[PDB]
Design an enzyme around this catalytic site. Structure first.
Site, PDB file in Angstrom:
ATOM      1  N   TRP A   1       9.404   7.255  -1.485  1.00  0.00           N
ATOM      2  CA  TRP A   1      10.728   6.849  -1.087  1.00  0.00           C
ATOM      3  C   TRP A   1      11.669   6.927  -2.296  1.00  0.00           C
ATOM      4  O   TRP A   1      11.238   6.936  -3.437  1.00  0.00           O
ATOM      5  CB  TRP A   1      10.732   5.475  -0.395  1.00  0.00           C
ATOM      6  CG  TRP A   1      10.277   4.277  -1.234  1.00  0.00           C
ATOM      7  CD1 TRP A   1      11.078   3.467  -1.981  1.00  0.00           C
ATOM      8  CD2 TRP A   1       8.930   3.714  -1.355  1.00  0.00           C
ATOM      9  NE1 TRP A   1      10.343   2.468  -2.569  1.00  0.00           N
ATOM     10  CE2 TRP A   1       9.023   2.598  -2.206  1.00  0.00           C
ATOM     11  CE3 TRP A   1       7.655   4.063  -0.851  1.00  0.00           C
ATOM     12  CZ2 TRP A   1       7.909   1.814  -2.558  1.00  0.00           C
ATOM     13  CZ3 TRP A   1       6.541   3.270  -1.199  1.00  0.00           C
ATOM     14  CH2 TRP A   1       6.680   2.163  -2.056  1.00  0.00           C
TER      15      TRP A   1
ATOM     16  N   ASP B   1       4.137   6.239  -5.842  1.00  0.00           N
ATOM     17  CA  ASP B   1       3.059   5.297  -6.013  1.00  0.00           C
ATOM     18  C   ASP B   1       1.962   5.885  -6.884  1.00  0.00           C
ATOM     19  O   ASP B   1       1.861   7.114  -7.072  1.00  0.00           O
ATOM     20  CB  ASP B   1       2.502   4.930  -4.656  1.00  0.00           C
ATOM     21  CG  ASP B   1       3.393   3.980  -3.896  1.00  0.00           C
ATOM     22  OD1 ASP B   1       4.308   3.357  -4.509  1.00  0.00           O
ATOM     23  OD2 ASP B   1       3.255   3.786  -2.676  1.00  0.00           O
TER      24      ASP B   1
HETATM   25  N1  TSH Z   1       5.534   1.227  -2.230  1.00  0.00           N
HETATM   26  C1  TSH Z   1       5.135   0.527  -1.202  1.00  0.00           C
HETATM   27  C2  TSH Z   1       3.771  -0.177  -1.145  1.00  0.00           C
HETATM   28  C3  TSH Z   1       3.535  -0.703   0.261  1.00  0.00           C
HETATM   29  C4  TSH Z   1       4.471  -1.340   1.075  1.00  0.00           C
HETATM   30  N2  TSH Z   1       3.889  -1.651   2.261  1.00  0.00           N
HETATM   31  C5  TSH Z   1       2.605  -1.232   2.252  1.00  0.00           C
HETATM   32  C6  TSH Z   1       1.583  -1.312   3.192  1.00  0.00           C
HETATM   33  C7  TSH Z   1       0.335  -0.776   2.891  1.00  0.00           C
HETATM   34  C8  TSH Z   1       0.101  -0.193   1.637  1.00  0.00           C
HETATM   35  C9  TSH Z   1       1.116  -0.129   0.681  1.00  0.00           C
HETATM   36  C10 TSH Z   1       2.366  -0.641   1.009  1.00  0.00           C
END
Ligand code: TSH
Ligand code: TSC
Lengths: 109, 360, 109, 361
Positions: free
Chosen positions: C39, C58
Site C-alpha cells: 500500500w 512489508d
Molecule cells: N501492513 C499491514 C499488516 C496487516 C494489517 N492487517 C493484517 C492482517 C493480517 C496480516 C497482516 C496485516
C-alpha cells in the site's frame, strides 16, 4: 473457589485451569483430548485434614487456553523423578501434543 | 528513489549478541528466539521456533540450532519433531534434521538441548514419556543414536574436558556418563556412586559447570559436586550454602537455570530467597549469592531483581539474569557483581538467555 | 525519531516498524523477505512543507516482530481503493505470507 | 475415584453463545475464536484458527465455518488456504475445503467471509493482490470458481431477500450484484449507477443491512442507500448524520464493523467521535448514535466505551460492541440502548464479534 490457583487440589498445577477454559476440574473443554499420562501431586485437604493423590492430566489438541494460569509446586520434583515433574508437557504422547489446559483429578488418599 | 532490500546480516558483531528464548507460553505455537545486543539493548532480529522451541548456538559461533515440533495442521495431522540449522549472521533457515516424535516438550532448561564439546554432535533429551538421549550428527544432518541406557535419567551436562562426553542425572541419585565414538554411537559408559539422596535432598538439574567438575545445588541449600577429571566420575557433598543466620530465616535456592560458575575465580552464583518451605523451589530470587567454591563460604550477596534464570560469559566476565521478561546485565570481574543495564521487554515468557559463543 | 509512530514517513503504517525489529525504514530485518507489492501513503513532510509518496512494503516470512506497533491512517482508504488500503497483509503474495514488520520507503514527491 | 473425560458439548445452549474472533495480532499465527456466554460472561470454549483466521456460523446454527492459511512449516513450505467446518456444539473439526492460495489476509470485517441467504454457498474475498470473489459449495465441500467480474471491487454484502445473490462495492463508486446459479457459478449480474464519490465522500464498507436495502456511512458522516427490492439496484444519498451542532464539533463515524441496523424499527447504530479530520476514520467511539432511517434524525446518543466494532441480534433485540479486548452487551428494544454487562478480557486483539444464530428463516 475451584478457579483459584490456591484451591487445595491445584497444589502442583503448572498450566491453565481447565475449569476456566470451558471444562471443569475433571473434564476437558469441548474439542480438547485428555492425556493418558500425567504428573501426580500430593495435596492437603484443609476441609477433612487428609492428604490426597491428585493426577494432573492435560487436555490437548487445541492451542493455549490462556485463562487462570497457575504455577504451584508443592512436592514437585525434577525430571529425574519424572512423574512428579511439572515443567514438561503431559500432552507429549497425545495424537496432538498442543497444550490446552490442565485438570486436577482426585485419585485417592 | 529508495529501494527496500532483504538479504542483510545482523548489524552488531557476534561478540555483542545474546539469545532470549521466548516460549510465549500464552501462545506457545509461536515461540521464538529474540536476538539482542547486550551492550546497548538493541533488538537485532529473531528466529521463529513454532511450538515450544529450544535453542543453542553452535560452539564455533557460525550457526543457530533450534529444536521444535510441527504438525501438518498445527492442532491436528502428522507430527514432525526436528532440529533446524540456521545461519547465525543471516538468521535464515538452512537445514531440517528429522527426529523421532519424542523430543522433550518442556520449559527451557539448558540441559535439554546441548552439544558435545567438539561441536560435532547435538545431544538432546527425549521423553515418550520413557526417557532417552538423542544424538544428532551435525555433519551428516542425521539422527544417529538413541541412548536408552539413560532411561530414568534427565538432562545433559557436557564434559568440557572431553570431545564427545556428557553426563545425565539419574533416579538413583547418581550420574551416568556417556562417551560417544566419532560416529555418534555410544563408545562407553559409566555410572557414579550415589551423589545425593533423591528423597531427602533433591538437587536442581542446572549445573555450575567447570572445565573438569560440576556443582549442583539442592532444594535445601546444599551443594554437591561431580569431578570428571578422570574416566570415572567422583561424587561428593553435601556442603551447605547456609550459615546459622541464613538457616534461621529459611534461605534456600529457587529458580530454573538458577546457578552459574565463573571459572577463573571459582565463584558460584545462586538465586536465593528467604522463608523457604515445600513448594518454593521455583520462586524468583530475592538475592543472588556469590559463593567461593574453594573455601565453601559466601563472599557477597546482592538484590535478585526477581530473577529466575541466568547465564555466564567467561571471557568478558559477565552474568545475565532474566525475570521472565527483562534481562539484567552484570559485570562479575570482581566478587561483587555490578549492574550495567536492564533490557526491558526482551520476552513475554522466557526462562533462558544465552550469549553468542566467542571461545571457538 | 524513526522508531516513533509520529514520525512523518509513517503516516499510513498499520503494523510493526521494521526499524525496531532489527531492520531499518528501508531494509528488512535479517531473514525476512520484502513484499514486491505494497500500500502507498501520501505523507506531509513537516520540514519542507511538501507531500511525499511513501510505499509500505512489508517484510515477510517470519512471525510477528511485536515491537513498535503503529496504526496511522492519513489518507488511507478502504479495499475498493486497494493500494491505498492498510487493513490487509501486504505479504499476501509472498512465498511465505507470514507478516513480520512494515517498512516506510520514500518514493518521491 | 474421579475419571477425566472428553467428548463433551458446550455447557450453555446455542442461544446464549457469541463468537469473539481473536486475531492475536502480536502472535497472528495463533489466532482463534473464543466462545462466550453473553448472559453471564462465561468462557465456553474456543476454535483454533492458525494464521489470521476468519469465522462465521452456518445460517442453520449447526456448524462453525473458519477460513485460514497454513504452511507446511509455518514460515516456510507449501501454502494451504482452507475453509474448515467445525461442529458448533462439540467444537471439533469435521472437514477441510481447499481454496486457491489467495484468500484475503486482513482484519476481520464481516464482508470478507459470508454466505448466501440460503446457506448453500460460502462467499469470500480473494486478493492475489488482484481481487475476485471465491465461492464454496457447502453440500459438495468444494471450491467452485472465482467470480472474476468482481475485479476492482471489495467485500461481500448478501441480499437477504434472495437465496444466492450478493453485492460488492467497486472502485467506480457503484455496486456490482452477482446472482449465482444452483451450481455456484455466476448466472447473471448487474452494476448500479455511481452511489458515492470515491474521491470526495468515500464510504466505510460495513453495511447497515436490511432485508431489501443496505445503508452505508461515509468518512464525513453522510449516509448512502442501496435498494435491492427489484432486480436492478437503485442507489441514493447522501443525507447527513449531522445536525448543525454536530457539524460545528466535527463529529464523524469511526471504527471497523462500525454500523448496525435494527430491522424491525429501522434504527441504525453508528460509532461516532468528535474533532474529525483526515486520518481519524478508525478512531474508537466517543459515542454510539442511534438514527431513525425513516425520519433521518438521531433518536439517541450514549457513551461509546471506546468501541470499534459491533453486531446486532434481530431476534433478541441486542447489540454487542467490542473495543478490541472487551465486549459490551446492550438491550436495544427501545430507542435508547441500555448497557446490560461487560465481558472483560474476551480477546487480546479482536475487531469482530457475532451471535450464534437463532431463527432467521
Ligand atoms: N501492513 C499491514 C499488516 C496487516 C494489517 N492487517 C493484517 C492482517 C493480517 C496480516 C497482516 C496485516
Ligand atoms: N501441565 C503441563 O503440561 C503444562 C506445561 C508445563 N510446561 C510446558 C511446556 C510445554 C507445554 C506444556 C507445558
Amino acid at each position: 473457589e475451584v478457579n483459584s490457583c490456591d484451591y487445595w487440589r491445584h497444589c502442583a498445577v503448572d498450566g491453565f485451569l481447565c475449569s476456566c477454559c470451558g471444562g471443569t476440574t475433571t473434564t476437558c473443554p469441548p474439542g480438547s483430548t485428555p492425556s493418558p499420562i500425567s504428573w501426580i501431586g500430593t495435596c492437603h485437604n484443609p476441609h477433612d485434614g487428609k492428604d490426597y493423590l491428585i493426577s494432573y492430566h492435560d487436555c490437548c489438541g487445541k492451542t493455549a487456553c490462556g485463562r487462570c494460569q497457575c504455577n504451584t509446586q508443592t512436592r514437585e520434583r525434577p525430571g529425574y523423578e519424572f512423574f512428579l515433574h511439572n515443567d514438561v508437557n503431559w500432552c507429549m504422547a497425545n495424537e496432538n501434543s498442543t497444550f490446552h489446559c490442565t485438570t486436577s483429578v482426585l485419585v485417592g488418599l | 528513489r529508495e529501494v527496500l532490500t532483504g538479504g542483510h546480516s545482523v548489524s552488531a558483531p557476534q561478540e555483542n549478541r545474546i539469545y532470549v528464548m521466548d516460549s510465549v507460553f500464552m501462545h506457545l505455537t509461536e515461540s521464538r528466539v529474540h536476538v539482542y545486543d547486550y551492550t546497548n539493548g538493541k533488538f537485532l532480529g529473531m528466529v521463529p521456533t513454532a511450538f515450544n522451541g529450544h535453542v543453542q548456538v553452535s560452539n564455533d559461533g557460525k550457526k543457530i540450532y533450534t529444536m521444535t515440533t510441527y504438525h501438518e495442521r498445527i492442532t491436528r495431522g502428522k507430527r514432525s519433531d526436528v532440529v533446524e540449522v540456521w545461519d547465525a549472521d543471516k538468521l535464515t533457515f538452512e537445514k531440517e534434521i528429522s527426529l523421532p516424535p519424542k523430543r522433550v516438550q518442556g520449559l527451557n532448561y539448558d540441559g535439554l538441548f546441548r552439544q558435545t564439546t567438539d561441536g560435532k554432535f547435538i545431544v538432546l533429551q527425549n521423553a515418550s514419556p520413557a526417557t532417552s538421549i538423542g544424538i544428532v550428527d551435525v555433519a551428516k544432518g542425521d539422527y544417529v543414536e538413541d541412548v536408552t541406557a539413560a532411561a530414568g535419567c534427565w538432562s545433559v551436562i557436557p564434559q568440557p574436558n572431553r570431545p564427545r562426553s556428557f553426563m545425565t542425572i539419574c533416579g538413583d541419585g547418581g550420574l551416568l556418563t556417556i562417551n560417544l565414538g566419532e560416529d555418534g554411537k555410544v563408545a562407553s559408559q559409566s555410572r557414579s556412586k550415589q551423589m545425593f539422596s533423591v528423597k531427602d535432598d533433591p538437587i536442581f538439574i542446572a549445573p555450575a559447570l567447570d572445565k573438569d567438575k560440576a556443582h549442583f545445588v539442592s532444594y535445601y541449600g546444599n551443594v554437591y559436586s561431580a569431578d570428571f577429571s578422570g574416566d570415572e566420575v567422583k561424587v561428593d557433598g553435601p556442603w551447605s550454602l547456609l550459615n546459622d543466620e541464613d538457616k534461621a530465616k529459611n534461605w534456600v535456592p529457587g529458580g530454573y537455570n538458577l546457578v552459574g560458575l565463573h571459572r577463573a575465580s571459582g565463584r558460584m552464583y545462586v538465586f536465593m530467597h528467604p522463608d523457604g518451605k515445600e513448594g518454593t523451589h521455583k520462586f524468583p530470587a530475592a538475592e543472588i549469592w556469590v559463593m567461593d567454591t574453594k573455601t565453601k563460604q559466601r563472599v557477597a550477596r546482592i538484590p535478585g531483581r526477581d530473577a529466575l534464570s541466568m547465564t555466564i560469559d567467561q571471557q568478558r566476565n559477565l552474568m545475565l539474569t532474566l525475570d521472565g521478561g527483562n534481562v539484567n546485565v552484570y559485570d562479575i570481574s570482581q566478587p561483587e557483581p555490578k549492574l550495567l543495564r536492564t533490557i526491558e521487554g526482551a520476552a513475554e515468557a522466557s526462562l533462558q538467555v544465552q550469549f553468542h559463543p566467542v571461545g571457538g
